[PDB]
Design a protein around this ligand. Structure first.
Ligand code: HEM
Ligand SMILES: CC(C)c1ccc(C(=O)O)cc1
Ligand SMILES: [Cl-]
Length: 393
């Protein structure tokens, strides 16, 4: 009853152009079986959303990568939030929610905005730039490590560690095994910075440690929660901002609408997250035999959710393949959905908003003027290089 497909969603062919294969996956049925990796797949919005919103049946504690923690050793100690189920999930989630709250956003907004304005001003002096290295990477590197309260030394390890984390959610292909074999220095750096004495007062890291006396988390849990922000908090935003700039470069009409109303910046970033979905795929593991879209899935089975596909499903979205900065984006799953829905989403949106605001007010045109190069990662979608010419407004 379940169709079997030979599509490898972790192949370079797929990463290069995933959209046709995603339609094939959606149109094959609500649930498919991927023979390449012996996992179930769901690529339609309705089933992805259903799976995300049933954490009892579709759990995270057995890993959200291909590997089943009940069968294999996790490459690093499990995340206390991403790779936990309720009730263990609930208090660490509450702490990170309070750390990355509205009040915190109010304390960092002016600084994030100033840095975004300054970066765009710098880039306009250069005119011809790489929108990845010089903007999508450079801007979050100029604000997030500082907001964490990291020392200056060693920050070159942050993006490699993130690449490793997102590759490690994948199957044991070359991308994954190469990342892990090179991992030791990046892990050593990240783990050390997670300790209380290495995190500057007033930062996100110190704030997590400060919550260790409320009864929500203990002191021994705090380093792993800092590790969650150092895993998830930088490379995601790099690919989100890169997505938005790439979208504005490819859809000049939308850049012109954004210029005419810079208060569209937050939605323009949100629509970039829907349209490119920086985080493409994640797994769950079934805790029982379950019926999903008329198909029966056995206990202890890995289920691959195609978030990018769900965000392009014409069953849910009108003109899904258009970038539309006045689209009603609510309901997209680019930040997940349900109890694990991105706890850093206010930081992500703040970065994206103030950068797109700066572009809207300072830039008249973004023209690609060189070869675009894609970055291949088992979980992350984005570019390696995006040469553009920026015309000042
Ligand atoms: C555009 C940028 C981002 C995207 C697309 C993104 C995407 C996601 C998604 C899809 C999930 C759900 C995972 C799941 O259901 O298993 C998630 C969770 C999470 N994200 Fe984000 N994220 C972004 C930025 C950030 C930032 C900036 C931070 C931290 C400062 C962050 C920290 C986390 C953490 C800690 C979780 C786990 C939450 C939980 O399990 O309850 N993310 N993110
Ligand atoms: C979903 C993605 C952004 C993510 C990656 C790692 C962690 C963690 O290490 O807890 C959390 C979320
Ligand atoms: Cl680690």
């Amino acid at each position: 009853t379940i169709p079997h497909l030979a599509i490898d969603p972790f192949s370079l062919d797929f990463f290069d152009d995933p959209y046709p294969d995603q339609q094939t996956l959606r149109d094959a049925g609500p649930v498919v079986y991927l023979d390449k990796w012996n996992v179930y797949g769901v690529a339609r919005y309705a089933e992805v959303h259903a799976v995300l919103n049933d954490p009892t049946t579709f759990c995270s504690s057995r890993g959200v990568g291909l590997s089943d923690f009940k069968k294999e050793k996790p490459w690093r100690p499990p995340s206390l939030i991403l790779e936990a189920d309720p009730p263990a999930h609930t208090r660490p989630r509450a702490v990170l929610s309070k750390v990355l709250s509205p009040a915190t956003m109010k304390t960092i907004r002016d600084g994030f905005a100033a840095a975004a304005d300054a970066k765009v001003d710098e880039l306009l002096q250069r005119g011809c730039i790489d929108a990845i290295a010089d903007l999508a990477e450079a801007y979050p590197l100029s604000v997030f490590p500082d907001a964490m309260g990291l020392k200056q030394e060693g920050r070159e390890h942050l993006l490699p560690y993130a690449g490793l984390v997102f590759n490690a959610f994948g199957p044991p292909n070359e991308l994954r095994q190469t990342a892990i074999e090179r991992s030791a220095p990046h892990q050593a750096y990240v783990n050390e910075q997670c300790q209380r004495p290495n995190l500057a007062p007033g930062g996100f890291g110190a704030c997590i440690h400060a919550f260790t006396d409320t009864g929500e988390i203990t002191p021994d849990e705090a380093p792993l929660l800092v590790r969650s922000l150092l895993s998830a908090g930088l490379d995601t935003t790099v690919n989100g901002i890169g997505a938005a700039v790439y979208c504005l470069a490819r859809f000049p009409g939308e850049l012109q609408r954004l210029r005419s109303d810079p208060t569209l910046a937050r939605n323009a970033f949100e629509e970039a997250v829907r349209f490119e979905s920086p985080v493409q795929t994640f797994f769950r593991t079934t805790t029982r035999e379950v019926e999903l879209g008329g198909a029966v899935i056995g206990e202890g089975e890995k289920v691959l959710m195609f978030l990018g596909s769900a965000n392009r499903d014409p069953r849910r979205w009108s003109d899904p393949d258009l970038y539309d900065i006045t689209r009603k984006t609510s309901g997209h799953v680019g930040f997940g959905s349900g109890v694990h829905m991105c706890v850093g989403q206010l930081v992500a949106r703040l970065e994206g908003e103030v950068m797109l605001s700066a572009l809207a007010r300072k830039v008249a045109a973004i023209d690609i003027d060189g070869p675009v190069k894609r970055r291949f990662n088992n979980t992350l979608r984005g570019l390696e290089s995006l040469p553009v010419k920026l015309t000042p407004a």
